[PDB]
Design a protein around this ligand. Structure first.
Ligand code: CL
Length: 128
């Protein structure tokens, strides 16, 4: 599923991300835009052999099991395919664990380079 901007903002809010660990909703929408273009089915391979999955591009090195990342962990205790569902619950729950791990949203390189320090509220402006 390819979300619309305001549609995703609403789903993220219902699932508890607005000001989760101090990050307003616009931060999460901006992050999803540049990680996945709002597409739940986005995948991208990393040079180390891991893969990033879903609307927030969660990495199989640490967070989910895809059966093809040797020496990896599965800290969210899910198959990586669950992060590709049209239902974003698994992605959101795993993202909350990531953002609580000490580096905040700097765990997402696209957030650090394209969202951090910008007017991220613009990503939710106009939304009901
Ligand atoms: Cl933080």
């Amino acid at each position: 599923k390819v979300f619309g901007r305001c549609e995703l903002a609403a789903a993220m809010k219902r699932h508890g991300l607005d000001n989760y660990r101090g990050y307003s909703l616009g931060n999460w929408v901006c992050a999803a835009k540049f990680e996945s273009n709002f597409n739940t089915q986005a995948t991208n391979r990393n040079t180390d052999g891991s893969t990033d999955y879903g609307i927030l591009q969660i990495n199989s090195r640490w967070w989910c099991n895809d059966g093809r990342t040797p020496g990896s962990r599965n800290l969210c205790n899910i198959p990586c395919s669950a992060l590709l569902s049209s239902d974003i619950t698994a992605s959101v729950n795993c993202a909350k664990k990531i953002v609580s791990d000490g580096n905040g949203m700097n765990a997402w390189v696209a957030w650090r380079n394209r969202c951090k320090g910008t007017d991220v509220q613009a990503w939710i402006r106009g939304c009901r």
